[PDB]
Design a binder for this molecule. Sequence first.
Ligand SMILES: CCCCCCCCCCC(=O)OC[C@H]1O[C@H](O[C@@H]2[C@H](O)[C@@H](O)[C@H](O)[C@@H](O[C@H]3O[C@H](CO[C@H]4O[C@H](CO[C@H]5O[C@H](CO)[C@@H](O)[C@H](O)[C@@H]5O[C@H]5O[C@H](CO)[C@@H](O)[C@H](O)[C@@H]5O)[C@@H](O)[C@H](O)[C@@H]4O)[C@@H](O)[C@H](O)[C@@H]3O)[C@@H]2OP(=O)(O)OC[C@@H](COC(=O)CCCCCCCC[C@H](C)CC)OC(=O)CCCCCCCCCC)[C@@H](O)[C@@H](O)[C@@H]1O
Ligand SMILES: CCCCCCCCCCC(=O)OC[C@H]1O[C@H](O[C@@H]2[C@H](O)[C@@H](O)[C@H](O)[C@@H](O[C@H]3O[C@H](CO[C@H]4O[C@H](CO[C@H]5O[C@H](CO)[C@@H](O)[C@H](O)[C@@H]5O[C@H]5O[C@H](CO)[C@@H](O)[C@H](O)[C@@H]5O)[C@@H](O)[C@H](O)[C@@H]4O)[C@@H](O)[C@H](O)[C@@H]3O)[C@@H]2OP(=O)(O)OC[C@@H](COC(=O)CCCCCCCC[C@H](C)CC)OC(=O)CCCCCCCCCC)[C@@H](O)[C@@H](O)[C@@H]1O
Ligand SMILES: CC(C)=CCC/C(C)=C/CC/C(C)=C/CC/C(C)=C/CC/C(C)=C/CC/C(C)=C/CC/C(C)=C/CC/C(C)=C/CC/C(C)=C\CC1=C(C)C(=O)c2ccccc2C1=O
Ligand SMILES: CC(C)=CCC/C(C)=C\CC/C(C)=C/CC/C(C)=C/CC/C(C)=C\CC/C(C)=C/CC/C(C)=C/CC/C(C)=C/CC/C(C)=C/CC1=C(C)C(=O)c2ccccc2C1=O
Ligand SMILES: CCCCCCCCCCCCCCCC(=O)O[C@H](COC(=O)CCCCCCC[C@@H](C)CCCCCCCCC)COP(=O)(O)O[C@H]1[C@H](O)[C@H](O)[C@@H](O)[C@@H](O)[C@@H]1O
Ligand code: HEM
Ligand code: HEM
Ligand code: HEM
Ligand SMILES: CCCCCCCCCCCCCC(=O)O[C@H](COC(=O)CCCCCCCCCCC)COP(=O)(O)O
Ligand SMILES: Cc1c(OCC(F)(F)F)ccnc1CSc1nc2ccccc2[nH]1
Ligand code: FES
Ligand code: FES
Lengths: 109, 435, 56, 380, 380, 25
Amino acid sequence: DFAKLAAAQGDAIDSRYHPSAAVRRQLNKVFPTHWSFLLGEIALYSFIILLLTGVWLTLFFDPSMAHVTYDGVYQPLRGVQMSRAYETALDISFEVRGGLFVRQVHHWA
Amino acid sequence: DFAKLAAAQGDAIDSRYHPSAAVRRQLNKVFPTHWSFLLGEIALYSFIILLLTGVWLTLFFDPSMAHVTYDGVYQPLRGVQMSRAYETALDISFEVRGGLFVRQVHHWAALMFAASIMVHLARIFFTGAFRRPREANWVIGSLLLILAMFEGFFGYSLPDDLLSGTGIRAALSGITMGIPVIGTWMHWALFGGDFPGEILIPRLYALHILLIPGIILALIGAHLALVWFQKHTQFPGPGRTETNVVGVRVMPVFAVKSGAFFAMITGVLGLMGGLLTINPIWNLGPYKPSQVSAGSQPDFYMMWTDGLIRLWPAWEFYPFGHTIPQGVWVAVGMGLVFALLIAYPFIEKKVTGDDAHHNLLQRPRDVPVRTAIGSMAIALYLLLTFACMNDIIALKFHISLNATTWIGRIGMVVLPAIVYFVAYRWAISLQRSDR
Amino acid sequence: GTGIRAALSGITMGIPVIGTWMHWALFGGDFPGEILIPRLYALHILLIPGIILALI
Amino acid sequence: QPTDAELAEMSREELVKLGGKIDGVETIFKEPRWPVPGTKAEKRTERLVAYWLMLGGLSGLALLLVFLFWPWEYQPFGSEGEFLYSLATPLYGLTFGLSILSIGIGAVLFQKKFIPEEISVQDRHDGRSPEVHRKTVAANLTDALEGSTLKRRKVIGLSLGIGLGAFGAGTLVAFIGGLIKNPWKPVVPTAEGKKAVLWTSGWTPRFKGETIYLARATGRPGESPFVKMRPEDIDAGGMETVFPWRESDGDGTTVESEHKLTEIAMGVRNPVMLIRIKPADMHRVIKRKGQESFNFGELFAYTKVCSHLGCPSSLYEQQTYRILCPCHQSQFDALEFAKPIFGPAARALAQLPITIDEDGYLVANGDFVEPVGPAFWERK
Amino acid sequence: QPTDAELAEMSREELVKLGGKIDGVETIFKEPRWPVPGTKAEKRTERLVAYWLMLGGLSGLALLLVFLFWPWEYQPFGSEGEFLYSLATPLYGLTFGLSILSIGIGAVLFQKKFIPEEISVQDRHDGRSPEVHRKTVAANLTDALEGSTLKRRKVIGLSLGIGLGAFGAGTLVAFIGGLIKNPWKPVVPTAEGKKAVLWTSGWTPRFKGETIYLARATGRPGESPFVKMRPEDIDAGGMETVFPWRESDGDGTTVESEHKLTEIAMGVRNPVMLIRIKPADMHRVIKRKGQESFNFGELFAYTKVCSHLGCPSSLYEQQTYRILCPCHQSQFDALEFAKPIFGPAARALAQLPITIDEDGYLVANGDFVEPVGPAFWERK
Amino acid sequence: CSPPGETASSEPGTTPAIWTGSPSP
Ligand SMILES: CCCCCCCCCCC(=O)OC[C@H]1O[C@H](O[C@@H]2[C@H](O)[C@@H](O)[C@H](O)[C@@H](O[C@H]3O[C@H](CO[C@H]4O[C@H](CO[C@H]5O[C@H](CO)[C@@H](O)[C@H](O)[C@@H]5O[C@H]5O[C@H](CO)[C@@H](O)[C@H](O)[C@@H]5O)[C@@H](O)[C@H](O)[C@@H]4O)[C@@H](O)[C@H](O)[C@@H]3O)[C@@H]2OP(=O)(O)OC[C@@H](COC(=O)CCCCCCCC[C@H](C)CC)OC(=O)CCCCCCCCCC)[C@@H](O)[C@@H](O)[C@@H]1O
Ligand SMILES: CCCCCCCCCCC(=O)OC[C@H]1O[C@H](O[C@@H]2[C@H](O)[C@@H](O)[C@H](O)[C@@H](O[C@H]3O[C@H](CO[C@H]4O[C@H](CO[C@H]5O[C@H](CO)[C@@H](O)[C@H](O)[C@@H]5O[C@H]5O[C@H](CO)[C@@H](O)[C@H](O)[C@@H]5O)[C@@H](O)[C@H](O)[C@@H]4O)[C@@H](O)[C@H](O)[C@@H]3O)[C@@H]2OP(=O)(O)OC[C@@H](COC(=O)CCCCCCCC[C@H](C)CC)OC(=O)CCCCCCCCCC)[C@@H](O)[C@@H](O)[C@@H]1O
Ligand SMILES: CC(C)=CCC/C(C)=C/CC/C(C)=C/CC/C(C)=C/CC/C(C)=C/CC/C(C)=C/CC/C(C)=C/CC/C(C)=C/CC/C(C)=C\CC1=C(C)C(=O)c2ccccc2C1=O
Ligand SMILES: CC(C)=CCC/C(C)=C\CC/C(C)=C/CC/C(C)=C/CC/C(C)=C\CC/C(C)=C/CC/C(C)=C/CC/C(C)=C/CC/C(C)=C/CC1=C(C)C(=O)c2ccccc2C1=O
Ligand SMILES: CCCCCCCCCCCCCCCC(=O)O[C@H](COC(=O)CCCCCCC[C@@H](C)CCCCCCCCC)COP(=O)(O)O[C@H]1[C@H](O)[C@H](O)[C@@H](O)[C@@H](O)[C@@H]1O
Ligand code: HEM
Ligand code: HEM
Ligand code: HEM
Ligand SMILES: CCCCCCCCCCCCCC(=O)O[C@H](COC(=O)CCCCCCCCCCC)COP(=O)(O)O
Ligand SMILES: Cc1c(OCC(F)(F)F)ccnc1CSc1nc2ccccc2[nH]1
Ligand code: FES
Ligand code: FES
């Protein structure tokens, strides 16, 4: 069952692209195991998290400098004149479920 | 000596990266020199022009929907309340040097981008390049057509003019808000409320400039990598076998030929972007929900859906205190069209029964069934494209005001059948013309 | 906004000869202007991350 | 395969063949374009290519000149500089596209008239791998799975699947959980409690007995003060556009009033088309079951928003009493309660009850008896 | 290089070794983690890995549950739901973070306790490529240039270089020319003609004799954010920020009035600090040349914009008479015409001449005698 | 199908009464 499907898909992939010699070369490549060698992965992983959280933030952010009057739920800033960029940044952290968590994860990342 | 410098730099590169074996294989790659094989080059080259011009436009565009009062140099719209999206679009065209030229080149590049995909898709369909082992590349390409379909629509709505805003209300909002069970949940989700809302343009701006191009660029990279390693097919001819490629090497023929073709595409796009005016947004003013213009100019890369809306009869269902409006048919119609287009080789191999390796392109006359079907599909697309300019067509014969759509209703089944029969008969005649 | 006003504006405008021309080309006039945030938004979501991804 | 001794004495012509043989490329025919150097035709062709390339530089220099020294600022229609401005963008594209188009033309001519013509055959090794890479890569993947002993440890395997599935389900829900909004969450304050957005419009009363006027727009709606009207303001067969305006909405003089007036014009279900039919046509008028006493005399009030997809139908034929939607060309018979007669529209336009107040101004007698605008799943 | 029949008779271990040898990789050490079967330690270690994976699944399910049902909406200060709301985001990170962290911990443990320990050696084969590849790739590139006849056709080569250079220069100028703006274009209407932006501010008179009031920000948005001020409103040792306000600016009730007041608030060179020196300290005041009469008695007005980089230097110490900039720690001696005495500031703050009108309201007695804000190349 | 909540009526319509207006605030 599960073994036949893998064999069938493997042959199907190999028949159309013949990536057997190349893939085996990538599987056999040797990397040193030193702890300090993992320091470049931390930056790479942080960038990936930044891409994922950054895409989420673009769905709610309006980067305008036009001045508007705040009408959100945050009482200490009700009526205060502000730009649309500051308007939606408050909206992300107060009016969107998980927006505060995502915005904080992005900046920590 | 320049040769001394070139040898030293080549020595330095080889000593550090040793790419001589890899580079030589890349330089010796052989590509067929058929004219129809440049169809995909134009689409790829137009995308690059869109990337370069789109970057320039992002430096002056504000995607905000916030209401502002115009204070630019355009006298007719002085003091008119508009959104930041419309004002900056006006700012690009008038108060930025070369902004109108870049704005029109970008729009013309999109039209050439969309047109090239459909023309290149026809070559793949008619010549049978979608067969094994190039079935997965057809699926990847089909996704590219769909992504480029919505990418142009989102960009056309970015200026938030009167014409573009009306299309959002009818197509993006009207059709979506009438989809069974989840249609209003999809509307409160994309629009973040009711039309128009305040996050429409900013959400589309992020999707149009960043997210969709990122997926398209990734899919294009996988598309180009597949063709490069799958050794692009060739037409049958003298010396052409199923286990060889006949053409020219990368150096120095194909590289110069492809590079010079890039200049012509850029040169042609620059000529149309400067001499031919496209999408004049200042003549219509900002979008207002209470105002809709009569005389418009919709794009041809997303009109077939509009033509299907008009031609389809007002058939609605009201099951148990509910409503299924006429817009559901068009939304469902796009689903079947996209589904059939994506999974054509799998259906084609199921009915023809051939699942063998193919490297030689099949002649269009050889298969009259597929040829006629492609001609029928092309014909059906054209009437649907031409079914939405009924406003001008009506004032040509004057036999009736409403009989124009009845021509479309009746003529969306007869003319495609006629085109199918003519193409099918032509293929057989051409088959035995030289046989 | 205080950080932008000092670092991005005062230092840029204090550069000799072409320092004020660079400030006008980037802010679209005087600080704060009306196009800084959208331009920074584009640079931050597409251009600089796009260059970083290519370099990575 | 050859040693370093052979490579020293190999010429360039044989080295190219040797490199192609390794890659599987066989250049079966290579011929120079000019077999006899010194002919005038070769010199003439060289000058033609140079002319195309030189024309690219001349046009490229023109692009720099026209971009700098040319009137580019926008000029109004009917002005001295209007003609020169209209040629600014065309010259930008004429000096740019033609500059690089000619360069590309001069390169194509060079490649097919000076670069030697060649036809090379490359052997394509398509299909399956030669049974040596297939076995090794299959063993490499199988050894990793079998060596790790993951197959025979069900407690780890099931936990890994459940653990990854639970984390994935939570992350995916939390990623899109902020883009899910209930469309029927009561948010609009009405006369009877709070209703959903779709069930309400600008004509929905906010308290019992509220007066809403059929106000005209002095200029652009939302930017000019709204003015009340009386029945003696529309001629026979005329058409007028009205908006829901309250006395407390102001006339746009103040900032708060300007925001209120903008919201009235921003309303997607706010516009209403007011039509007065001639007295010699009231006989051929068919009412609707529920809207028999909605009209005031020969004045009728139908919503301007089309029932098909939401386009405000602005066109109106006074001769035939037909309402035409400019988007998909739908006609509504205003005589027969604005029912659709042709096009993709299937539902009649909603009718707003109207009357007059003590001062004679036209007012709305109530709210719509049905939802306004395009239909949805939970409608009626 | 084995044959097809030999590969079919090879075990998985030999095929892995053959593939590694083909790839140039030799595994010198490879042993299972548990050579002795049926041990309690192996079962104990198996449960340890599963426990961490189970924790990840439980936390992932918890993340799904808290995101759907925990109260997430903002609650005002002093409300009953404020405490629960303050734990909404903390619960999101605790459940999400612990879930994937536990999965990562289990994956590390599985590798270190069940995946066999291996040591592999791979030959680098780095450095210079084999001479067969170097000669062939060099010949391929050389044959293209030596056979394209481009080198010996100088008119074509010069034309291509000039044409590409001219087109590149043209397209570069057109691409960046739109961003270029002249800093010193006179666009600001003043009392003596149009002036550049950097030479003007809100205190620059738009006509001779224009009355500009020292207005105080009331802190409320709209409804007169700026009101007139009197000398007796500020006590000795006090400091207050003032803005340039005119009669025509209005109280912000009208839409045009709000925009005019918004421009005053966002003017970068607008804010001015008004300080009242203690009368006992008036003998310590040192006047700047050309500014001896810029103070109305014991009231002094200095620009709020720091001369170093433009930050608002508003940390006024009443006793030491020091104006401290919070950005880079610049200090100005308010008694000695705001002369800098510490930090990176080298120029004194500009002094605004002030006086009173017939009604007793503090007004500006002219414009600044020097540019306000950070310095630039064209200054003084 | 035809919309169930859309049918013609034959009963004559009466002139609407004048509007008075009850102020809530
Ligand atoms: C399986 C699919 C195949 C099809 C078969 C299955 C479905 C067939 C079964 C039923 C079904 O369809 O359910 C799905 C739907 O559910 C929810 O719809 C229900 C209901 O159906 C709607 O019709 C109803 O309209 C909704 O009430 C809203 O309006 C109410 C008022 O309206 C009535 O009046 C309207 C017009 O008239 C009035 O107009 C205005 C109203 O004030 C005023 O002007 C005025 O008052 C006027 O009245 C006049 O009246 C008289 C005149 O003579 C006189 O008195 C006066 O003169 C006066 O003026 C009519 O037009 C309407 O028709 C209606 O009659 C308000 O009262 C409410 O407050 C609110 O605003 C209501 O919502 P609720 O009660 O909030 O929630 C309940 C719950 C749903 O229950 C279920 O069974 C769910 C399970 C079954 C469905 C599938 C889901 C489960 C499967 C699994 C999840 C799969 C793994 O929610 C939910 O869990 C929904 C969650 C999302 C869906 C997930 C799918 C899965 C996701 C992945 C695919 C909404 O969420 C819809 O979006 C959603 O589609
Ligand atoms: C090579 C580098 C090494 C260094 C050495 C070389 C440079 C050293 C050589 C010189 C040099 O530096 O040039 C470069 C610069 O050039 C241009 O600067 C010049 C000048 O220098 C500036 O000081 C001057 O300020 C500019 O006038 C503006 O203000 C004027 C007023 O101001 C005077 O008053 C100020 C304050 O007082 C008044 O304040 C307000 C003014 O109204 C009012 O409140 C009030 O009136 C008040 O007055 C009071 O007065 C009395 C009190 O007692 C009483 O009467 C009353 O009580 C009253 O109240 C002081 O603070 C100021 O100092 C000044 O004294 C206005 O009059 C103008 O209208 C305008 O607004 C002026 O501009 P213009 O005339 O427009 O243009 C001319 C032309 C430049 O000529 C050149 O030589 C260019 C060639 C040499 C430079 C290099 C370029 C060439 C090389 C190749 C290109 C390389 C391949 O332009 C251009 O081509 C510039 C193009 C861009 C540069 C490209 C570089 C290449 C790009 C790639 C790198 C600007 O473009 C600058 O950005 C630029 O840096
Ligand atoms: C004023 C203003 C602001 C306007 C807007 C700004 C704007 C948009 C500016 C545009 C600027 C642009 C785009 C500049 C273009 C300049 C340009 C291209 C100049 C070249 C001129 C010139 C000297 C020509 C020849 C010299 C030369 C050798 C250089 C060209 C270099 C190039 C482009 C070589 C490409 C080589 C190559 C391998 C590519 C082929 C295509 C790719 C990517 C692979 C896909 C592919 C595959 C996989 C096939 O198998 C295949 C088989 C059969 C046919 C086609 C293909 C095929 O294309
Ligand atoms: C015989 C045998 C067993 C042999 C072994 C098999 C073997 C060895 C392998 C060889 C291959 C074979 C033969 C095996 C079978 C392969 C197989 C299973 C085939 C399937 C593969 C396949 C077809 C490809 C998958 C591609 C893929 C990723 C899926 C995409 C899914 C689809 C269909 C997407 C389309 C849906 C879509 C985009 C519709 C949205 C439209 C809607 C509803 C939106 C509404 C809507 C909106 C919202 C607008 O904005 C709008 C704007 C303007 C106008 C209108 C609209 C509008 O209507
Ligand atoms: C036990 C119940 C759930 C089962 C468990 C499994 C979960 C399945 C996945 C769903 C996760 C999303 C949860 C969102 C949270 C939740 O519970 O929402 C409630 C919404 O009603 C509901 O229960 C409806 C349930 C989910 C229906 C989803 C709707 C259908 C699809 C079609 C929607 C389109 C999405 C795109 C994918 C489709 C692509 C098609 C190709 C309350 O709405 P409300 O509070 O009004 O709105 C607030 C804002 O105001 C506030 O800004 C903020 O945005 C939130 O707070 C928001 O909730
Ligand atoms: C975006 C930031 C960066 C990322 C994501 C990144 C990623 C990596 C990774 C994953 C590796 C291999 C693992 C390792 O040795 O640590 C690596 C290696 C390397 N990186 Fe970075 N890197 C970044 C920045 C830098 C910087 C700032 C430098 C030096 C200025 C640098 C120079 C190198 C070099 C020389 C290597 C060689 C690896 C080696 O020989 O051990 N990288 N990088
Ligand atoms: C974004 C749009 C697309 C771009 C930029 C693109 C680009 C290209 C390019 C440059 C080639 C090189 C060979 C040639 O041009 O003929 C190519 C080949 C190919 N494209 Fe496209 N393509 C696109 C869309 C599609 C579509 C819509 C299909 C089919 C649905 C498709 C299927 C293929 C196939 C099968 C090949 C190679 C077939 C063969 O080897 O003969 N592509 N594509
Ligand atoms: C990839 C395919 C693309 C298509 C088909 C496309 C198409 C369009 C179209 C039709 C418009 C409306 C043009 C007009 O205003 O008249 C537009 C606008 C715009 N495009 Fe693109 N575009 C694409 C890619 C991009 C990319 C990658 C960017 C990235 C910056 C971009 C940036 C913009 C901007 C900023 C606007 C709006 C400003 C304006 O309307 O002038 N585009 N696009
Ligand atoms: C989203 C899914 C996309 C496709 C993923 C496919 C994952 C399953 C791969 C199954 C491999 C079959 C191995 C096998 O023993 O069957 C073999 C199939 O034949 C092959 O050698 C296939 C070579 C190409 C495999 C490349 C796969 C690369 C995946 C990398 C994963 C890290 C059967 O050989 P055998 O008779 O056992 O000697
Ligand atoms: C030097 C420089 C820069 O250089 C611009 C050049 F091109 F002109 F050189 C660009 C951007 N930032 C910096 C410095 S950081 C900084 N952060 C601050 C926060 C508050 C106050 C002051 C601050 N200063
Ligand atoms: S929008 Fe009125 S007819 Fe389609
Ligand atoms: S900004 Fe005031 S010290 Fe630098």
